[PDB]
Write an enzyme that holds these catalytic residues in place. Structure first.
Site, PDB file in Angstrom:
ATOM      1  N   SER A 166     -11.058  11.800  -3.717  1.00 35.99           N
ATOM      2  CA  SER A 166     -10.576  11.416  -2.395  1.00 35.99           C
ATOM      3  C   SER A 166      -9.078  11.146  -2.464  1.00 35.99           C
ATOM      4  O   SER A 166      -8.489  11.132  -3.550  1.00 35.99           O
ATOM      5  CB  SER A 166     -11.311  10.164  -1.901  1.00 35.99           C
ATOM      6  OG  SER A 166     -10.987   9.030  -2.687  1.00 35.99           O
ATOM      7  N   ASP A 195     -11.632  10.051  -7.903  1.00 34.87           N
ATOM      8  CA  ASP A 195     -12.966  10.345  -7.398  1.00 34.87           C
ATOM      9  C   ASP A 195     -12.976  11.525  -6.427  1.00 34.87           C
ATOM     10  O   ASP A 195     -13.991  11.804  -5.786  1.00 34.87           O
ATOM     11  CB  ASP A 195     -13.551   9.101  -6.721  1.00 34.87           C
ATOM     12  CG  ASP A 195     -12.889   8.791  -5.391  1.00 34.87           C
ATOM     13  OD1 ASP A 195     -11.669   9.025  -5.256  1.00 34.87           O
ATOM     14  OD2 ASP A 195     -13.590   8.298  -4.483  1.00 34.87           O
ATOM     15  N   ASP A 198      -5.747   8.740  -0.475  1.00 34.81           N
ATOM     16  CA  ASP A 198      -5.376   7.696   0.472  1.00 34.81           C
ATOM     17  C   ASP A 198      -4.162   8.198   1.245  1.00 34.81           C
ATOM     18  O   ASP A 198      -3.212   8.700   0.651  1.00 34.81           O
ATOM     19  CB  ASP A 198      -5.048   6.394  -0.259  1.00 34.81           C
ATOM     20  CG  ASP A 198      -6.231   5.855  -1.035  1.00 34.81           C
ATOM     21  OD1 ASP A 198      -7.359   5.927  -0.514  1.00 34.81           O
ATOM     22  OD2 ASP A 198      -6.034   5.355  -2.161  1.00 34.81           O
ATOM     23  N   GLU A 209       0.831  -1.193   0.000  1.00 34.02           N
ATOM     24  CA  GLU A 209       0.000   0.000   0.000  1.00 34.02           C
ATOM     25  C   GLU A 209       0.877   1.258   0.000  1.00 34.02           C
ATOM     26  O   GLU A 209       0.583   2.229  -0.692  1.00 34.02           O
ATOM     27  CB  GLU A 209      -0.912   0.038   1.236  1.00 34.02           C
ATOM     28  CG  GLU A 209      -2.101  -0.915   1.213  1.00 34.02           C
ATOM     29  CD  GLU A 209      -3.159  -0.526   0.195  1.00 34.02           C
ATOM     30  OE1 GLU A 209      -3.088   0.598  -0.348  1.00 34.02           O
ATOM     31  OE2 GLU A 209      -4.069  -1.339  -0.057  1.00 34.02           O
ATOM     32  N   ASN A 219      -8.465   5.935   3.281  1.00 37.35           N
ATOM     33  CA  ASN A 219      -9.207   6.845   2.405  1.00 37.35           C
ATOM     34  C   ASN A 219      -9.958   7.989   3.082  1.00 37.35           C
ATOM     35  O   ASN A 219     -10.657   7.798   4.076  1.00 37.35           O
ATOM     36  CB  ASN A 219     -10.166   6.019   1.536  1.00 37.35           C
ATOM     37  CG  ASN A 219     -10.830   6.839   0.450  1.00 37.35           C
ATOM     38  OD1 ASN A 219     -11.971   7.266   0.595  1.00 37.35           O
ATOM     39  ND2 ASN A 219     -10.113   7.067  -0.645  1.00 37.35           N
ATOM     40  N   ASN A 256      -7.012   9.895  -5.666  1.00 38.34           N
ATOM     41  CA  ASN A 256      -7.881   9.054  -6.480  1.00 38.34           C
ATOM     42  C   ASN A 256      -8.705   9.921  -7.422  1.00 38.34           C
ATOM     43  O   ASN A 256      -9.001  11.077  -7.121  1.00 38.34           O
ATOM     44  CB  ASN A 256      -8.810   8.226  -5.596  1.00 38.34           C
ATOM     45  CG  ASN A 256      -8.055   7.301  -4.663  1.00 38.34           C
ATOM     46  OD1 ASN A 256      -7.285   6.447  -5.102  1.00 38.34           O
ATOM     47  ND2 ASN A 256      -8.277   7.467  -3.364  1.00 38.34           N
TER      48      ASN A 256
END
Length: 129
Positions: free
Chosen positions: A50, A48, A52, A35, A59, A46
């Site tokens: 958002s 969208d 991480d 990760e 998130n 991301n």
């Protein structure tokens, strides 16, 4: 900060992740490796809206507040920036809630793609835990 593999292993075991909800320490170290490559400053934007954050790429849409994610919920009750510290306490406690959110470790896509079903014990090799 960038953790050594066993160093992170120790830190995670110290925070009660070994066998948490039936997930061996190996699973958590492996998830961290893929990760964020053990980098606490890791961040991934991301498509969208958002982002991480941290060693476990938590998130911003549901778990932490970074103040720039539409319709975001702050279920872990913490600013996302706290997930970028050298101390993993914040990330671990939030991760403990996520793993119990009804999907096991499937919540972490990299874990699902590179750790699930594998010999995760290898990620703990050489560690004096």
């Amino acid at each position: 900060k960038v953790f050594g593999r066993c160093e992170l292993a120790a830190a995670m075991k110290r925070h009660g992740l070994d066998n948490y909800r039936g997930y061996s320490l190996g699973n958590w170290v492996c998830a961290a490796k893929f990760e964020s490559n053990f980098n606490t400053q890791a961040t991934n934007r991301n498509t969208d809206g958002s982002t991480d954050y941290g060693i476990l790429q938590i998130n911003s849409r549901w778990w932490c507040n970074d103040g720039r994610t539409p319709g975001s919920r702050n279920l872990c009750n913490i600013p996302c920036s706290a997930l970028l510290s050298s101390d993993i306490t914040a990330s671990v406690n939030c991760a403990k809630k996520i793993v119990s959110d009804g999907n096991g470790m499937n919540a972490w896509v990299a874990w699902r793609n590179r750790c699930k079903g594998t010999d995760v014990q290898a990620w703990i090799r050489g560690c004096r835990l």
